[PDB]
C-alpha cells in the first residue's frame, strides 16, 4: 500500500510539518537530509545555499558552531525558505520537565524559534516528549523519536523500539516520525530518517535503506561534507535515494 | 565493609577527580549536589556563593542560562575553588564520534574548559564515552554514566543498567561514577549520584543514602524553591550526611 510522498502529505491525520516536508520532497525529487557537521557559520550558510536545492532537510548541531548567533539562524531560515528545506536541530533531547522545555525554548540557542524539527531520546520515558511538546505544539514544530540505533553496542532493543513507536502514536500532534535504521511504524503519517548511509564501502546504500528497509529519508554527512565537490556529492546521494524511493512504488 | 569517603579517596584505583570529590566531601561533611536550575547568571552565582560551603557539587544546565557568557563560568569556577565544590554540567551527552567531542570541547559553551564532571547516556553504545574521553582525558576531567532513569516509563531494564556498569569499568580512566537511584556497582572507586530527592517519584535522603547505598543526593526544587535557600541546603546536607554516617558502622 505504498503511497507517494505527495499523497502522504494529503493524509487526514498528517502533521502540518510532515505534510510540508513530504510536499517539498515530492516537488524537488529529494529525500536527502544533509548532516551539516561544521563548526563555522560561514561554511554552514554556504553549504545550505549551494546544496539547498538538492536536499529536503538540513540537520544542524548548533552547539558546535563556534560563532553561533541568532542572526546566523535568521540567515539559515532565509535559505531554508528560498530553497525549500526544513531545519532539523539534532539536539537529541533527553531531559524532562521544565529543564527540557527551557533547553528547547530558551537559553542562548532558542532552538524552537528556528528549528522546524528536533529529535529526542525515549529512554527516560515520555517525559522528554511531554516537556518538549509544552513548547513545540504552540509553535507548530515537530519532533522525531530516536527509535533504533546501529552504532556499536547500541542498547535499543526490540522492546525499546516498540515503546518509541507507541510514544509517537500517543503524541502524534507533535511527533512526526523516527530516527531508525528501517521502517518501524506501518502508519504512513510518520516519517523515517536513517543515518549510516554510503554509496561506496557497517553503513548501507540508499537502495538498502530506502528500498529494502522502507525508510523515507537518508541522513548523510561526511560522504558529502568531506568531498571536494560537495554539490556533485549531494546529487549522487539524492539520485540514489530518489530512485530507491521510486522503485519502492512500482 | 562499607568505607568512609575519606578512605575511598585513597583507594589505589581511584580516579583523581573522584578522589578530589571524596576528599572535599569528607572535609566539609557534605554529600549534597545542588541542582542550580535557574536561568539568569546573577541567581546562579549568588546561589553558588551562598550555598558553596554546604555542597560538594553544583549541577548546571548552561544551555538554559539566558545570559550565558564564558566570563560567567569564570566567576563560577572562582567560587567553586573558593568554597571547594566541583562543577557538574548535566548535559546528558548522547552523540558519538567527532560531534560529541565538539559538543564537549567547543561551540559557544566550551563545557570541558569549566566542568569538572559531565554525564552521558549509554544507549548509543560506548561511542558516547569514547568521544568524550578524547577530550576529557587530556583535560583531567571525569564523566558519569546514566545507569538508571528514575522517571515514569523509563526504558532502562536490568540489562541496560548492567551494560552501563560494564561500560564504566572498561572506561575507568574517565568514568568516575553513575547517575542512578541506588548502588549499581559494588566497586567503591565509583560514585553514585541520585536525583529525585525530597525530605517529604521522590525519595528521602535517609532512604537514598542510608538504605539504597547511594553517595550523593541531587536536590533542586527542595532547595531552590524554598524562601531561605541556605537553610534548606543545610537541612538536606545534614540529612544526607547523617544517612551516610549511619551506614558506616
Ligand atoms: N550508524 C550511524 C551512523 C551515523 N550516524 C549519524 O549520522 C550523521 C552523519 O554521519 P556521517 O558523517 O558518517 O555520514 C551524524 O550525525 C552521525 O552521528 C548515526 O547516528 N548512526
Ligand atoms: N524522579 C526524578 C526527579 C528528579 N530528577 C532530576 O533532578 C533534577 C530536578 O530535581 P528536582 O525535582 O529536585 O528539582 C533534574 O536534573 C532531573 O533529571 C530525576 O532524574 N528523576
Residue numbers in the entry:
A (entry chain B): 223 to 423, 431 to 479
B (entry chain A): 223 to 422, 431 to 479
Question: Which passages does the manuscript contain on this structure?
Answer:
Orotidine 5′-monophosphate decarboxylase (OMPDC) converts orotidine 5′-monophosphate (OMP) into uridine 5′-monophosphate (UMP) and CO2 during the final step of de novo pyrimidine synthesis, which is essential for producing DNA and RNA nucleotides. Recognized as one of the most efficient enzymes, OMPDC accelerates the decarboxylation rate by a factor of 1017, and exhibits a net transition-state stabilization (ΔG #) of 31 kcal/mol. Its unique ability lies in achieving this substantial enhancement without the aid of bioorganic cofactors or metal ions, relying solely on interactions between the substrate OMP and residues at the active site. However, the key catalytic amino acids at the active site are highly conserved, including two lysines (K281, K314) and two aspartic acids (D312, D317), which form the so-called catalytic tetrad in the sequence Asp317-Lys314-Asp312-Lys281 (numbering from the human enzyme).
To further explore the structural basis of nucleotide binding to OMPDC, we synthesized CMP from cytidine as the starting material. This allowed us to examine how the C4 substituent influences binding, as CMP and UMP are identical except for the functional group at C4 (an oxo group in UMP and an amino group in CMP). Using ITC, the wild-type OMPDC exhibits two phases of CMP binding with apparent dissociation constants of K D1 = 4.73 ± 1.09 μM and K D2 = 8.33 ± 1.06 μM. These values are pretty similar to those estimated for UMP binding; however, the crystal structure analysis of human OMPDC in complex with CMP revealed a completely different binding mode. The nucleotide binds in an unusual anti-conformation to the active site, with only partially resolved pyrimidine and phosphate gripper loops, indicating high flexibility. The cytosine base binds to a new pocket, where Gln430 of the phosphate gripper loop is typically located in closed OMPDC structures. Residue Gln430 has been displaced from this site and cannot be traced in the electron density maps. Compared to UMP and similar to the reported structure of MtOMPDC with CMP, the number of hydrogen bonds is significantly reduced. , Despite this, the affinity of human OMPDC for CMP is high, probably reflecting an entropically favorable binding. Interestingly, despite the different binding poses of the base moieties, the configuration of the catalytic tetrad remains intact. In conclusion, the C4 oxo group is essential for proper binding of native and artificial nucleotides due to its ability to act as a hydrogen bond acceptor in the interaction with Ser372 of the pyrimidine umbrella.
